[PDB]
Symmetry: D2
Subunit: 334 residues, 4 copies
């Protein structure tokens, strides 16, 4: 129903497209990148991580054709020249990784779009949303440049909400053992982050992440209570959050796990999942939820310090949340 445009047809852009194919309320009519339709069509059809696309993909001129529908292909590195308005695109998914600042993301609006969903932490955005945690704060009148946060924040926020509401978080620190991404390097190349400059598939690479602090954007009561880091490892996809927190109320491992499972089957169903099986990262590839508690790893000391481990497919889960958010925003009127 709602016309959607994707800017930056990369890992998130393409997987967002795959997810959109499963939602009748969202119609992707155009994509933009820095290559030709032949290239984007080939990358969309064949995926090194998610397999062959379950749909008919071809090229007509320099446009894509998916299951009978033609998708307009653009190649403008300056978002201001996208002319979204001319093709009736109301919502733009900004997933290039280069326009997270409002001054750049807003160019889509200058170009005729109505709403912009930045697929990452942003700067000067109207509001940062994590589905299942604060989409209720979205205001169609005052919100036009929206951030869907990072995949890590979408993993953490959902269960941090449960823990705080049920037991109260005094403070905590997290570490995300994360798969490498396209922001890393193949073989020691110059990079702003001297850690990310190192061969991505050869080492455990400690790096930064504002995911823990970003939680306060969707859960203001946790402001200043969480901190964290990341460790990029030699896997192509799927990551895991490791939170150690000091709780206000005294608890047992069983109480913590019950609260999480209750939320997973209730209020956060589809967003937060709960697993009691001894699985590994590959088993979560293709998972659409934002966070899956690894219940076997939950532990507690003195009934006050707890460790919660949660899995997340940083590509598929997040992409699904982008599409969910677009439908949500659309349902509130454009």
């Amino acid at each position: 129903a709602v016309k959607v445009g994707i800017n930056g047809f990369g890992r998130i852009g393409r997987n967002v497209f795959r997810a959109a194919l499963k939602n009748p309320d969202i119609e992707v009519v155009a994509v933009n990148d820095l290559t030709d339709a032949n290239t984007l069509a080939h990358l969309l059809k064949y995926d090194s991580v998610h397999g062959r696309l379950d749909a008919e993909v071809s090229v007509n001129g320099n446009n894509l054709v998916v299951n009978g529908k033609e998708i307009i292909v653009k190649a403008e590195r300056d978002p201001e020249n996208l002319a979204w308005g001319e093709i009736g695109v109301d919502i733009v998914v900004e997933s290039t990784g280069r326009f997270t600042k409002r001054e750049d993301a807003a160019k889509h609006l200058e170009a005729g779009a109505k709403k912009v969903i930045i697929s990452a932490p942003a700067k000067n955005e109207d509001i940062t949303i994590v589905m299942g945690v604060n989409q209720d704060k979205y205001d169609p009148k005052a919100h036009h440049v929206i951030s869907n946060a990072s995949a890590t924040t979408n993993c953490l926020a959902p269960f941090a909400k449960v823990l705080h509401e049920q037991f109260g978080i005094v403070r905590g620190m997290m570490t995300t053992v994360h798969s490498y991404t396209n922001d890393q390097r193949i073989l020691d190349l110059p990079h702003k982050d001297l850690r990310r400059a190192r061969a991505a598939a050869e080492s455990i690479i400690p790096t930064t992440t504002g995911a823990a602090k970003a939680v306060a954007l969707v859960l203001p009561e946790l402001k200043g209570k969480l901190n964290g880091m990341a460790m990029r490892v030699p896997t192509p996809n799927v990551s895991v959050v490791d939170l150690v927190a000091e709780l206000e109320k005294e608890v047992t491992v069983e109480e913590v796990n019950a609260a999480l499972k209750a939320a997973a089957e209730g209020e956060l169903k589809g967003i937060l999942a709960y697993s009691e099986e001894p699985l590994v990262s590959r088993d979560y590839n293709g998972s659409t939820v934002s966070s899956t508690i690894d219940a076997l790893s939950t532990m507690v000391i003195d009934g006050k310090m707890v460790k919660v481990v949660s899995w997340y497919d940083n590509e598929t889960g997040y992409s699904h949340r982008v599409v969910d958010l677009a439908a949500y925003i659309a349902s509130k009127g454009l």
Copy 2:
């Protein structure tokens, strides 16, 4: 000086041999495994992780020949038939991973050996030692079967000692992002640990670890105060400990790092190192210390909760410790 025997010439067995080559007080005269001299010689010379052995290696009958010296090669599945006594072996490094129970390791003594160093956490051992933390507790009269702990415990114990002495640890939890080992599997094979049964180079694999609790064996004051887990990832060597602890005293990042650096230069030099460089795991391959603080990763919340990250070459660092313990024990008289 002292004559050493190595049972299980594997990853730790061979790397202990490399370490011993640089120590004059230690003399390896025999090694045991389940193959021939040709194979062990080949494996000793060419290492996929630590490169070509910087020494002359050849074979002569059932003996290895390194830099002129000859090392006897045995192939007894049952350590009871090793006849250590006959060849004057005083200290036996038990590194097969099959004889961690005291009743089994003791077979070496029955075979004529003086002491036995189990290269791993043990069961019913006379005592567990972590060099630089509690070797002063070793008693030559009563300690015959000693455990040198796990590489992970050797990385954690040292800096946990400093944090407790200077600030006092109330409670804490750790996670070690650890390289895969030979106890894991190439492609989904039966394993007592259903996580470790999965393809090791394809996933982030959570698995239990008794390292956090094992710290109590070398630091009784921390009994019941720590706990943790492990996450095996697609790297061949080098691991890292991530500790989040609640302290008794209030601190700042600067204070924590300052105290860690001081210990690295003083009491724990050669055991604990300190780094202000933004390095990755490959950079630590070949490191001889047991623990190296990644100072740039240190963080604190409310001045009470701290995170400390420390690197360790689970093969090289641990192997050196094994030799240090061998020399130490020997210095107390056999």
Copy 3:
């Protein structure tokens, strides 16, 4: 229809099971290995390479329960103690890798089975078969221990057959860049093959193979005309055959590709596939054919020397051929 038993429920054993679920004429009633049902059930449900099994899987005593059907689980190290006859098993898939010699494989016959399919090159087998090339040579009265050859031979033979019939092969050499298998080692460990003793995920590992020679077993006119080698690389599954051959007739890339495409759509449909897409190994994961020509890689030099490259999912393709062979053998009467 025909009752089948699987000895060695590993990579091939379990994937053969998956293929069997898709063939109504094959009923797997029991499997044997060296572990418990819980472990086998877990490995069958979650696969690091092919994903979650799309079937209901549970355990009942010593039986697996797949889609309501009961599958007996044995744990007999000695094939002679399997008692296949007692449970009406007529065909046994020998996939442990330990019994490729006829004298050993025949132990299944001693235990009551009627036919034994060795899932690999064998010694003194009654006959070696490659579906699509020589199943017509199977003799129900004289062939009881049959080899289904290697995955590599199943990949090469089909297109070698086309090249020979259409252009005539004088002689040729092949190299198969192959994914690592459980016959290799995680980290430098003892192995009869000193190349395979080295860390599998860290190097390109040359290793011998009789796959090219084995072609003569299914295509006698190529006896003494082919030979080759293998190179194991750090990929979990999917391999590719690289054949360079001297032809009797002058040819061009187009003529070679056209003849290959013609056979893939005709006589070898389902066994041999043809692709003009610029794909990579991950794209072939799950492919059920024995051989897929990478048409873009076809080359010819000086008119008479050709290079043909073909892909094969060494697990899925082969496993499907095993089941195909079991159905064919059965159709001939037991």
Copy 4:
């Protein structure tokens, strides 16, 4: 002795610098890239592939300092603004990968350099040289823009030269199982080569190469007789050439290997090496020769077709040849 400048301080650029440190007649006075001195210093000190640099490395202002000597650091995207003349640089190693066309590489000359060594196959170069094969063809008065070919051609040419001179090559095909390089992609991303656009550490990736045809540039008699391809695999460094050729003479494996060893000990010592050890790629990391025969892999079929396999550290071997070439060129007069 000769002042050298490096344009593109990447994998080849930095490894050439390492080789230079060991050659008294070569002096790198300046390097140019697209970042700062601190970033380049960090990358020079810590190498994910070749370990830490064994030398003192620091920064002083906008320059590097190695073992007391200062190295000027430039950050000019346009080689024409390098002012090589103003600092006495006579030979420029062009290793950015963007200026392989003579018109572009010639800009270094316009900037005051006397000779330009393109570290790769080139277009319209005055001449292409492979040390040990045709440096004698270098004419100091007519050759200013010189190509040192690719690492693959430097591996192939030396033994192709031996096989042709001894037995005569009618025609042949090669495949190089090559480690991934910085020209590939971490995860699926747009690329002019749709194969190279795929996750580099996840697949076996077929791709083109002109190495086989390029041999004609250094060995004219082989013009039109050789062709080949490449297969990029999940390893960070070290590659291997696999050549299959039809010979004019009937030969034996022992005859081929003996001829190769003879050239390795004489005519091509230091360029071509010979090994009878069953090694793997990791074992060749750091190797400085251009090509090492894997004697155990040599194979002959039907007397006239041979397969020769040779290893090469595509980073170290080639980098040493670049330095050897600069020295040679210098000895002919600037």
